[PDB]
Ligand binder design. Structure first.
Ligand SMILES: O=C(COP(=O)(O)O)[C@@H](O)[C@H](O)[C@H](O)COP(=O)(O)O
Ligand SMILES: O=C(COP(=O)(O)O)[C@@H](O)[C@H](O)[C@H](O)COP(=O)(O)O
Ligand code: NA
Ligand code: NA
Ligand SMILES: [Zn+2]
Ligand SMILES: [Zn+2]
Ligand SMILES: [Zn+2]
Ligand SMILES: [Zn+2]
Lengths: 293, 293
């Protein structure tokens, strides 16, 4: 069922596994994510960015997820506002029915980040909603700051900057993350931690995309082994979007290329859903949330 | 708000205009249709085929429409099962919350078509749901059969075969419809009538599809002038799907062609929604449902 984000992530925290947090922008993405969770017996974090909310309308974002939760009532599901940029945005999400909200104030100095995060936490906790915040920038997280930040804000989960970035072009050269910083943050905070920019761009997905005429010039994601290492270090929420988009659009491009007469939307989007679903299923197995319901 | 189909079509029948009945398979199609109705101040028939229902799930088909109706509460909307093939399918749609259902038994002889239609009508009317049926095959409709069929079945609206067919390839030669049969059916039945296979393939939609590399070899739709003549002859519900698909997919193909690095779904589907919306807006103006709220 639809539950507070902490319900899912406190379990992952105590049992030492990662829960993928999968972005969606429409029905096809959401359906494929849910079918993956059903097939792998995995809890689900479903997340929508501010741009996704603008595209769908917040009423449709929440409404579609509630329909899907009722279709699969045995699956723990949290609905999460990804990268909220203002208090008002987080408050709108709480009022619409999100069960987790993130406030990204990491571009501010410690004191202002803490102040704004604490304001969001007070509002969200009063409504029974869990909160994510972010600390560090690509300087990276100061683990002693993270300790005090969590103690004072009462935030439920923290995204500490350890070297990732969003999108398909994460590393100019070889992938590298600061796992020692991660472990120190985990030791001092003892809460669930969040990894942003965690797409892997797997080889099969990249190939599917390029074969269909797409270009991913110099793309590089987080290797599978780094994702496993981050879970071993205490990451419990693993934000994943780019991998889903590439796998989905590769199949759309393929249909467009191979039948110029095809205009049935379902003939484009059924194979796209399948490819997205498979990415999610594999990721749930990799992160350790499979068979955890 | 969401209303019985007959509420919308009795008005169209009395006032002599046509209401487009627009198919959808996902959120993007549905959103564009509703924005068109909002912008043209037009009532909406929103329809889902059995295949569309399988693709979305009936819970999502109804649920998304209910969200959209709440977003635009001033627009009269009927939610219609298009081309139900069995009593049980129509019954499932009634139970899920559809406000209009169609049973297509036109491939049976008169007596069996009438029997099955009557069974659907009894079930749907008991639940406050309107019913569409079909008579004739591309032998065309016998107006005297239509008279008896409507009287005995109590069906709310009838689709009489006058020469259309579904899809992009409607006429091997010149477009021809039997407007005399139409007028006789209307005179004898005095109920709202339905035109199936009513896409026009407008020149600008065809051009966009071809400019993006698509193939529509041999395609031919119902001319705008024939749609207007049909309305003058008593057509009140105008089933439209192909035009929407072509306009939408033309823009998807265009985005794929012009940026091989693009994999944000919203960048494909925002222009696709706009093109679909514009087809619907123009069609609402052509059929006379604009400014009828
Ligand atoms: O960390 C993220 C995903 O990382 P990724 O790019 O998949 O490695 C998400 O939380 C992003 O913030 C989200 O994908 C941004 O979405 P939009 O703002 O483009 O909708
Ligand atoms: O008459 C119709 C549309 O006509 P069109 O092809 O747009 O001229 C609809 O009622 C069709 O029955 C519907 O488009 C079929 O949809 P699917 O069965 O392919 O979903
Ligand atoms: Na987030
Ligand atoms: Na119909
Ligand atoms: Zn950030
Ligand atoms: Zn971030
Ligand atoms: Zn038919
Ligand atoms: Zn038909």
């Amino acid at each position: 069922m639809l539950v507070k984000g902490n319900e899912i992530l406190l379990k992952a925290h105590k049992e030492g596994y990662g829960v993928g947090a999968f972005n969606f922008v429409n029905f096809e993405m959401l359906n494929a994510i849910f079918e993956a969770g059903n097939e792998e017996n995995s809890p689900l974090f479903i997340q929508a960015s501010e741009g996704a909310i603008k595209y769908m309308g917040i009423d449709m974002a929440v409404g579609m997820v509630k329909i899907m939760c009722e279709r699969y009532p045995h699956i723990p599901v949290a609905l999460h506002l990804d990268h909220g940029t203002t208090f008002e945005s987080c408050e709108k999400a709480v009022k619409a029915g999100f069960t987790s909200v993130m406030i990204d104030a990491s571009h501010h100095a410690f004191e202002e980040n803490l102040e704004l995060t604490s304001k969001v936490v007070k509002m969200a906790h009063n409504a029974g909603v869990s909160v994510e915040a972010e600390l560090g920038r690509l300087v990276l997280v100061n683990p002693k700051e993270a300790e005090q930040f969590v103690k004072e804000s009462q935030v439920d989960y923290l995204a500490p900057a350890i070297g990732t970035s969003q999108g398909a072009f994460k590393f100019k050269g070889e992938p590298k993350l600061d796992f020692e910083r991660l472990q120190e943050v985990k030791r001092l905070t003892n809460i669930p931690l969040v990894l942003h920019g965690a797409s892997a761009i797997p080889d099969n997905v990249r190939k599917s995309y390029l074969d269909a005429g797409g270009d991913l010039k110099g793309s590089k994601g987080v290797p599978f082994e780094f994702l496993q290492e981050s879970v071993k270090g205490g990451i419990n929420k693993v934000n994943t979007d780019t991998d889903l988009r590439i796998a989905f659009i590769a199949e759309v491009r393929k249909v467009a290329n191979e039948d110029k007469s095809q205009f049935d939307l379902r003939k484009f989007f059924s194979p796209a859903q399948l490819a997205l679903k498979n990415v999610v299923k594999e990721r749930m197995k990799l992160l350790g949330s499979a068979n955890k319901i």
